[PDB]
Amino acid sequence: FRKMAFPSGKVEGCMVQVTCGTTTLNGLWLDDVVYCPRHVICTSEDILNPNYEDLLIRKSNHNFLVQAGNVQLRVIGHSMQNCVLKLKVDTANPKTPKYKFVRIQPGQTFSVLACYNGSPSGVYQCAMRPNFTIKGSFLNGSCGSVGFNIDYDCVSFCYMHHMELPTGVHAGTDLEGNFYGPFVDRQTAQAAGTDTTITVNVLAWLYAAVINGDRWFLNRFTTTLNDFNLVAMKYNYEPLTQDHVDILGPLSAQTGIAVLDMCASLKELLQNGMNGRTILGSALLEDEFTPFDVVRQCS
Amino acid sequence: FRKMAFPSGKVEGCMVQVTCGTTTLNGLWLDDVVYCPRHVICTSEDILNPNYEDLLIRKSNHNFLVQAGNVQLRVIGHSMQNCVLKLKVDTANPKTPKYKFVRIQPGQTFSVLACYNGSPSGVYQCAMRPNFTIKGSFLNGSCGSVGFNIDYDCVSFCYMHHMELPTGVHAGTDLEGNFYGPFVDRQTAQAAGTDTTITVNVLAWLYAAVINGDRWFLNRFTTTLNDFNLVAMKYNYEPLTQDHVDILGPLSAQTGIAVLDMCASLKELLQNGMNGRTILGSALLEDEFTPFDVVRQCS
Ligand SMILES: *[C@@H](O)[C@H](C[C@@H]1CCNC1=O)NC(=O)[C@H](CC(C)C)NC(=O)OCc1ccccc1
Ligand SMILES: *[C@H](O)[C@H](C[C@@H]1CCNC1=O)NC(=O)[C@H](CC(C)C)NC(=O)OCc1ccccc1
């Protein structure tokens, strides 16, 4: 199995650059609105504890330089929604895809189009960790890069990049500017809470192994969801939700292995280890493939 | 630090679907020519042992059904270059990027845009293995998907997909239709030569681990180039040349670790194992990042 990003072309056509002062970051141009991180209006003196409301009252439309490549888009209105700035421009983007703004859950994956100065640089898959960070690859100038899923030509934007944490992982908002996790857009020392293993994704990976004929770990036990969740927490695994059980439905049907039976299999792996055996050619259990990713790659 | 693919938009606009008889696969539309694998002309019986020139002379232009999105393109001519068919169409692709056709070297990387029925499905990074296979993610109908690199807006196409070996690795051609490796577009179970590990890429990846603040594998020892190559060859690694040492220059200069010092690190890792530890989250030595890949991502 491979981490497979979505084709990025529909998002590439939406990337612009936004400069305020000497700060340039990326923005997302959909119809006649450009979305970008609000900290673009900050100066080096403002970043430690910015007063965003007061900083925005001092700004005008003519303070914002929005460029598609080197072509300026005239700004005709501006507002702030949570942690994102919305700049109304005088041109509707003709490359706007069908799209939706979505807030994802921990465990869900998405493609990131890493951008600099409005120019796309690369694309890769990320998983939202239970502590609401992602292991991205972002350098200076990457803020405003977005993460997305594509379903039948509709782009669901779920992530806009804002910051790096001391441990090297990353944090950001949805496209309504609401941070994932307990982070704030200040230049302050923030620490990711203790992370956990994404149980629903590990189960998806065990289903993927079974589909491919690797099923030594299928055992003779079952469990209740509550009994499993209590054991999972003792191994730093996430508890399963009702939604998790349901999204494992298609893989359970495809293999004929009930979800709670697979849970009992993983429970044995957690209490006894792998004993030098592998699963899908790996000694480690993979937790960044969702049940959709497994189906997507096997279809 | 992640495996990062190039943004795929410039290639997406080039993908079309090619149908001949009962066979459907993808084609690459540049200017007024569509490139696709020639085994599209084969039927279920032809494929075991096809005489392609004989099969192709018996085809007409109207035997080829080319679809770009919903619109039909009309084939007004056709020729064959090695294992690739060149279908001349009456419309120029308006989305043709600046492009070149290149034959890539073993150890080099490229991005694959996996397509089905002419529609892009996913994007991911691959390396050309020393045995001229690629470890990809390809299903039925993925033939004609292409691999590429992008440099300053110029797409360099290096790979077109043709088949999957029984081991699950993949084989294809350059855009001139010549296979990478000893493979042939016939429906037979084919084996590759023994694969080896791309040593220069393992070293680049160890340097990436240090740029990202990881050092558990470093040691105080050093080695000569020839002594390293003796151990490398013993573990089925490719030889390291002086040109490789030079190409690793920037990564050594950035981290202040001499190339031959890092070779002594890898020698130790090869002779001791990783001992249950991980490097950049991996439990195995990674050889699909080139020195350029590491540089581009890290700076
Ligand atoms: C967006 O331009 C930038 C993304 C950082 C740059 C280095 N890697 C990243 O992901 N965001 C910030 O620099 C962000 C801005 C406000 C939230 C204050 N601040 C931040 O991430 O603090 C940590 C940091 C700053 C500069 C370099 C490295 C880490
Ligand atoms: C192209 O659409 C298709 C590629 C994929 C790769 C994954 N599974 C696929 O089907 N190519 C073929 O089907 C190819 C056709 C030949 C005429 C080149 N055949 C092939 O991959 O067969 C491999 C094979 C043949 C006999 C025994 C075992 C394997």
Curated annotation (Swiss-Prot), chains A, B:
Q: What's the subunit arrangement here?
A: 3CL-PRO exists as monomer and homodimer. Only the homodimer shows catalytic activity. Interacts with host FBXO22; this interaction promotes the proteasomal degradation of nsp5.
Localization? Host cytoplasm; Host Golgi apparatus; Host nucleus
| Positions on the Cytoplasmic side per record topology | 1-299
Question: Any idea which residues are catalytic in this one?
Answer: H39, C143
Q: What is the lineage of its organism?
A: Viruses, Riboviria, Orthornavirae, Pisuviricota, Pisoniviricetes
Shown segment, full-protein numbering: 3266 to 3564 of 4405
Glycyl lysine isopeptide (Lys-Gly) (interchain with G-Cter in ubiquitin) crosslink location in chain: K3, K88
| Organism (species) | Severe acute respiratory syndrome coronavirus 2 (2019-nCoV)
Please give the function described in this protein's UniProt entry.
Cleaves the C-terminus of replicase polyprotein at 11 sites. Recognizes substrates containing the core sequence [ILMVF]-Q-|-[SGACN]. Cleaves and inactivates human TRMT1, preventing tRNA guanine(26)-dimethylation of tRNAs. May cleave human NLRP1 in lung epithelial cells, thereby activating the NLRP1 inflammasome pathway. May cleave human GSDMD, triggering alternative GSDME-mediated epithelial cell death upon activation of the NLRP1 inflammasome, which may enhance the release interleukins 1B, 6, 16 and 18. Also able to bind an ADP-ribose-1''-phosphate (ADRP).
Could you name the domain of life of the organism this protein comes from?
A: Viruses
Name of the protein in question:
3C-like proteinase nsp5
Q: Which stretches make up the Peptidase C30 domain?
A: 1-299
Kindly state which reaction or reactions the protein catalyses.
TSAVLQ-|-SGFRK-NH2 and SGVTFQ-|-GKFKK the two peptides corresponding to the two self-cleavage sites of the SARS 3C-like proteinase are the two most reactive peptide substrates. The enzyme exhibits a strong preference for substrates containing Gln at P1 position and Leu at P2 position
What is reported on the regulation of this protein's activity? Inhibited by pyridone-containing alpha-ketoamides compounds 13a and 13b. In turn, alpha-ketoamide 13b (tert-butyl (1-((S)-1-(((S)-4-(benzylamino)-3,4-dioxo-1-((S)-2-oxopyrrolidin-3-yl)butan-2-yl)amino)-3-cyclopropyl-1-oxopropan-2-yl)-2-oxo-1,2-dihydropyridin-3-yl)carbamate) inhibits SARS-CoV-2 replication in human lung cells. Inhibited ex vivo by michael acceptor inhibitor N3. Inhibited ex vivo by compound 11a and 11b.
